[PDB]
Amino acid sequence: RDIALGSSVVSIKNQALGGSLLHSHIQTYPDGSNQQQVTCYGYKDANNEWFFNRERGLPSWSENETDIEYLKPGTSYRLVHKSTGRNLHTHPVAAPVSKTQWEVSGYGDNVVGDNKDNWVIEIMDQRGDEDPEKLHTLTTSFRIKNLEMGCYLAQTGNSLPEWGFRQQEVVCMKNPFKRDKRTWWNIETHEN
């Protein structure tokens, strides 16, 4: 099974030891940008659900489209938090705990946003043999790179303070080692 843009609702699990699910919620950062927090969380929840949308400026996905569009490594996408409708976002703002890395937030919606809402998938490993060019549920390991920034989405290992419910810090890491697993993700749950 393959992941498509719009109609695949996914959870995204980090591959480091201690890795957990990409998460967001209405709470905002007290410092930094004051934007919506993004974290990793360890338990099943609706706030772990994401879907991929088109790059900024293209028409947003709807249920009335002509074809299924499979996610392609190399192509720009917007990673949308299903519960809040905010886009995964980064910027040159110091992360809350890992202060030499960049803060990751939830920003905008379909109309409001900007070029830092665009991310690119890089396939690092495929276990078993379906299309090597496609994202598969729980066998494809991938990095999520911010197109503008050039940085990679990562669960650092640090916990947030109680303003972030002591969830795991997520940052955009500058210049990591390609095999750092903090920066490695897979699709865990996939609902159509």
From Swiss-Prot:
Keywords: Acetylation, Endoplasmic reticulum, Glycoprotein, Glycosyltransferase, Membrane, Phosphoprotein, Repeat, Transferase, Transmembrane, Transmembrane helix. Residues 1-55, 68-124, 132-190 form the MIR domain. GO terms for molecular function: dolichyl-phosphate-mannose-protein mannosyltransferase activity. Disruption phenotype: Leads to diminished in vitro and in vivo O-mannosylation activity. Residues 1-192 are lumenal. One of its GO terms (cellular component) is endoplasmic reticulum membrane. Its main location: endoplasmic reticulum. It is found in: Endoplasmic reticulum membrane. Belongs to the glycosyltransferase 39 family. Present with 6510 molecules/cell in log phase SD medium. This is Dolichyl-phosphate-mannose--protein mannosyltransferase 2. The chain holds residues 340 to 531 of 759 of the full protein.
